[PDB]
Amino acid sequence: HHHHHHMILLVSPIDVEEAKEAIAGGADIIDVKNPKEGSLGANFPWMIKAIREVTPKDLLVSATVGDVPYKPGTISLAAVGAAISGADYIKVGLYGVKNYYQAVELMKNVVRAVKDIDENKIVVAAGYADAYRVGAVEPLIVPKIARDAGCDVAMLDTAIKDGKTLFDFQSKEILAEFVDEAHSYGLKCALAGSIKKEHIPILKEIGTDIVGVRGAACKGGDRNNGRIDRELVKELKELCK
Amino acid sequence: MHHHHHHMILLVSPIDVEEAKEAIAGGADIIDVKNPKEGSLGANFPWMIKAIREVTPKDLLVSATVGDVPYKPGTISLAAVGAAISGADYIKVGLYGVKNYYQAVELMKNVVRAVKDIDENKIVVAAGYADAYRVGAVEPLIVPKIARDAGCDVAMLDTAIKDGKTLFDFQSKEILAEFVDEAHSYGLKCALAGSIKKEHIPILKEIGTDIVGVRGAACKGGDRNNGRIDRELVKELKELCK
Amino acid sequence: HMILLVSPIDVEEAKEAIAGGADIIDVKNPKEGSLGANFPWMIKAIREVTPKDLLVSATVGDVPYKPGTISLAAVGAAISGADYIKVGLYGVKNYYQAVELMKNVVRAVKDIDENKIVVAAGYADAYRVGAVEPLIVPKIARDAGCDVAMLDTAIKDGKTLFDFQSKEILAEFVDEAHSYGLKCALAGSIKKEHIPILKEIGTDIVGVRGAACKGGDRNNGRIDRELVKELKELCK
Amino acid sequence: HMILLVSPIDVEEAKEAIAGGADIIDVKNPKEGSLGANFPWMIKAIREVTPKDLLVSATVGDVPYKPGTISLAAVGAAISGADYIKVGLYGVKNYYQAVELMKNVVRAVKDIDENKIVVAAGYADAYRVGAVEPLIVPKIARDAGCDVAMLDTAIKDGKTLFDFQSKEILAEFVDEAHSYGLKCALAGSIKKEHIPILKEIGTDIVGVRGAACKGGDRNNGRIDRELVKELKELCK
Amino acid sequence: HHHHHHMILLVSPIDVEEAKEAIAGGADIIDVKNPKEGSLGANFPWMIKAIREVTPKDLLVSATVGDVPYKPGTISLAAVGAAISGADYIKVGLYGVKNYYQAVELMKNVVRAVKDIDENKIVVAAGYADAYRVGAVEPLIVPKIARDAGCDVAMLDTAIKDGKTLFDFQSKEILAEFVDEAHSYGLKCALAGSIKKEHIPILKEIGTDIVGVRGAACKGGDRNNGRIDRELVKELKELCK
Amino acid sequence: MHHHHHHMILLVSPIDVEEAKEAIAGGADIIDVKNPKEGSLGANFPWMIKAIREVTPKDLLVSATVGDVPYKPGTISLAAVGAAISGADYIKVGLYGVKNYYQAVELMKNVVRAVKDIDENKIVVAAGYADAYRVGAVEPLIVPKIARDAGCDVAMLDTAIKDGKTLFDFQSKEILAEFVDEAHSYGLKCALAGSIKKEHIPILKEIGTDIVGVRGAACKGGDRNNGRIDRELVKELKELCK
């Protein structure tokens, strides 16, 4: 069935000034990532810390640990590093994990590492809508991975940043089934992947909980001319109402 | 250099709390928390590093690996914070996915900053593979320059593939001696590992190695996977390192 | 109750499976892979020798992502006498590629005879060969209009269905297929000891080769009627 | 004299080739590769629309080394209405693999109708895709019992048959096929200017798509009857 | 048709003593190769020279330039190096060359380099009976490559030294056609590939011109226990009569 | 080291006799016979090396590449004999397929023996790739030690992939200066190339480079494939090297 519930806005800045613009426009979650290391590339402990310091205590600070290989120990340590640096919401890009079992094994360890620091901290299992292009775990099993590993959020994003969006890799129907499945497990659902303002009603209709933006919040959109503008964030925030 | 007697620090690598207790009882100087299931320098879990630190006497050091790392400075910096916060005094980075000098220095500079920002007294180890060519890892011979230029404390070598072939099957005594001298001229300490057997100890002592790393030689059956760390074997090794 | 599927490689092996009480006679060629295709003449020879009350199954291969070729091969298997047409989802990498290929196979088969069965088969150990995730096979079968959602093993190294999938996940796969109105078939070096577990989880069809072969050896041994008689009793 | 083969992708394109005077109507699917297979229903629809005095050709694909699957696909193409059955020797790496696959396709096709033609097709640019050496295709066709030895290009980047094979080597290929009692078919972005050269060397069948398409573009353009009329005149 | 003509015996030694044993048994061609660098691995200029010095002037000294990549310039220079070092008969292993055109291009340059030094020196185009295992040029087109490049000999050998022979990769019929084809071009034919004494009558029957042996001339046969024995060479030489 | 003025030997790489005549007329010190069709340090033919030697004045040196070589010591030793016999005084080996120090030293030792056995006065150049990581070639930074241990005369760097990226896009001025100093401390000469432009000449002079290698900068259109060696461009370069 159709939905018309509020969606939380997650904005991905690369520095402190970008984050201040995201905060001023009304973003709910300030996401610390590093596109240079991939789709969900990890930033540095000092950048997470600087962004936490600047971000009001009522907003969440999010941090990616990377487009991860199947290395549970390394990724559990990296999640501790992100949590200790001030992240409340930790994203794991399920890139090098090839199946359900490898993904659940890695995620169970990240959940333990994070919840041992603070039980209130959020663990996000992120899959790639275009996983076939990088050989990543099937995006369609991400709600079951999140469910079985004890995560809080089932998420999708795009691995290759070539201008192709979430909607170029997954149908509205399959995305609706992904959202419903995550919800039936008691999980929240976050969607990203070069999301444009025109995609927001489609995402609201299918009952997405969280929407992630970078390009749509940038004045140019592209890596060269694009800088996060508060007015663009305000526009997005209004479409999420 | 060629030393007639040379004291070496003994590093033993356990996988759990009971193995760590055996390495402590045998007289190991450094207790190295690793996970062979994830590779040569595979990372263990934050809770395991903490449990081993808790059981290790305060006069001894706890070492931990962050993995056979890809070129991901952000991820590895975060992992180094995780290892340091969990109780490691000595943080080891396996330079596996890094392909050249520049990638290795860039990654290591960030790990050094991440670790020193927690505690300036914590040690950062840049580890290369003696058999790097077999896995496409950065040339082992440039590891002293990487450690020097990234601000690390230790230049190290180990083997990537655990097929029974040792450090000495990949590097000559002469080249290993030049590696030790080069590390020392940069004000760095030198650690050597790679299926090191008790017979290798006099050779490593001669070349001036500061730290010797073992797992297999300290394991009951001899096998580093099938067998478990035995205090008696650690004791025999500790005597040879004196 | 569970249906027993036995996989022979020739006419004498098919006769041995029939005599033992196998419900479905599956024509495959292990030389071409896990679900390797046999020849049109072999499918016809086996159909001819199989009693009319029993079903003849045939694999089209461990298929690449080539909808046209596989649709033509499915026509070839159906025309040769196959009742059940099995597709090994090997070269297909995701949900969309698998649904696209399967939709075309379903159309090709149903255009010949609407009563013929289409089986979407995934690999329990897909990660070892880079095949489509086995856990999405019930959704693929549902969306392509197939009749059976199936799992088997891609690499025949002695590792079984149970070495790659937990009883819990296998039970969820069966329930999911059933909720879509599909039948469920399970294989992958299945031994006699696995039969009560597969029965418990509600599997409709169990597929065997090795367990039906004399020296246990699927690659050096041959189908024996006594072994097929024992598996049939265990299936009841 | 040279026989003109035109490759349409649908019923309207086939009608355009027929109206222009094409001798052989070749059903292929460029989306699946150079000799990608179309669907059983498309081969049937094209056969239905083609006058009985003209031949219908169909590709089974840029095939992997899977004799069973390709034999079944060859049955599917033959049953669907194909008179000429074309096999793209892509995944086969040597003489032995190619002969083994082709022998099985020949048996599958001749078992349906002894009058149906089997075409062993190699790639003039095989080195680019790691396919079997094109120069041994006449011996493969001879030893597998095929009727036609053929060449085409695997990668459709604008490079032609003549960019990969010399006139001299192509003439030797034609002579070799003829000495084995085989017919020879040549394709690979063939343009109208290539027709006198192919005629000189003694080629029996010339295969076109691009030259028959409006914007020259095979991937954006469609078969035009006027272009097929011009190629037919040049073939006389 | 069947044949019963004399076949020339080519023996492959690794050092000067092995070559002295080959000479004493009656070998016709003393082949200088280096199995450490592959099937037709190249030995060193000094080893070729040492073997030439020891070999009577009426016997030919043969030398391989390697299991070659598609590098015409390097291989032409290496053929000059082998010819200048005392080789009269130069073998090129067509390993990295992928088709007819690459093979003819490389071979034409080797022929020019060698014939410019001495027109009487022999150029051998060698293909691999098991080429599919290494991705080498199709062995069946080697007579046409040799013909079009102006070589003197069309040859086959095995690329992988796992105990599988020439007869495990090519049928007697296809090998007979290869010999007949080379002969119809005015070329000589050389065959090798773990050739055992039992294979010699089959090779004589099909009219092979030259037979190459290493293992069959060694007392053990295997790399560890195998050293060329003059009695073994004498036995082979008698089967070649 | 940092030199205020430093004379550099100018090496120009022609592909045929007419290009060689243009490089001679422009004042090139070394005439380098290469074949870009076979790679960065692709080998030309024995007859081309001979034809170029014949046309080159006796006071100038003729250089020739043996290729972007695989690890095949026998083949490369034979190729080095071929280049030397054909008229090259200066033999360049591209360390491409060699993966480590040991493979590189083993290959180079054999090339040195093959060349010196013909003429002890002939020069052996061990060439590494500044961008080795892009092709999986041996680490460029160990090339001075390879040249030292194999008994070569020159330690050299060039670029493997000709995509417009230069020596300076892969190696810092500082690391290049250390490479030159290291080569000099071993008694070796240093040659540097890799899409070197006229603007790079003062930098290479400053770091103490002995030989500078060019093709593109001496080519009429600027393009090293599309264009041809022009005497005027060689003359402008020769003046900057003075």
PDB file of C-alpha atoms in Angstrom, chain C residues 3 5 24 26 55-59 77-78 81-86 109 116-119 147-148 183 185 205:
ATOM      1  CA  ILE C   3       9.078 -36.664  -3.857  1.00  0.00           C
ATOM      2  CA  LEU C   5      14.253 -37.208  -7.776  1.00  0.00           C
ATOM      3  CA  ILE C  24      11.251 -38.062 -11.084  1.00  0.00           C
ATOM      4  CA  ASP C  26      16.401 -36.276 -14.016  1.00  0.00           C
ATOM      5  CA  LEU C  55       8.011 -37.497 -14.701  1.00  0.00           C
ATOM      6  CA  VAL C  56      11.125 -36.854 -16.802  1.00  0.00           C
ATOM      7  CA  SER C  57      13.264 -33.868 -15.709  1.00  0.00           C
ATOM      8  CA  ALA C  58      16.104 -32.343 -17.793  1.00  0.00           C
ATOM      9  CA  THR C  59      18.690 -29.635 -17.125  1.00  0.00           C
ATOM     10  CA  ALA C  77      14.656 -30.191 -23.804  1.00  0.00           C
ATOM     11  CA  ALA C  78      10.768 -29.902 -23.879  1.00  0.00           C
ATOM     12  CA  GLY C  81      10.493 -35.374 -23.897  1.00  0.00           C
ATOM     13  CA  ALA C  82      11.270 -33.413 -20.708  1.00  0.00           C
ATOM     14  CA  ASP C  83       8.295 -32.634 -18.413  1.00  0.00           C
ATOM     15  CA  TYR C  84      10.362 -30.618 -15.894  1.00  0.00           C
ATOM     16  CA  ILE C  85      12.830 -28.099 -17.393  1.00  0.00           C
ATOM     17  CA  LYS C  86      15.667 -27.113 -15.003  1.00  0.00           C
ATOM     18  CA  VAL C 109       8.342 -23.859 -22.515  1.00  0.00           C
ATOM     19  CA  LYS C 116       5.316 -28.515 -18.615  1.00  0.00           C
ATOM     20  CA  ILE C 117       7.167 -27.450 -15.379  1.00  0.00           C
ATOM     21  CA  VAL C 118       9.890 -24.712 -15.223  1.00  0.00           C
ATOM     22  CA  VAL C 119      12.499 -24.951 -12.423  1.00  0.00           C
ATOM     23  CA  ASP C 147       6.781 -23.539 -10.884  1.00  0.00           C
ATOM     24  CA  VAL C 148       9.743 -24.687  -8.711  1.00  0.00           C
ATOM     25  CA  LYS C 183       7.121 -26.037  -5.064  1.00  0.00           C
ATOM     26  CA  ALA C 185      13.318 -28.834  -4.623  1.00  0.00           C
ATOM     27  CA  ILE C 205      11.256 -32.652  -3.909  1.00  0.00           C
TER      28      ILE C 205
END
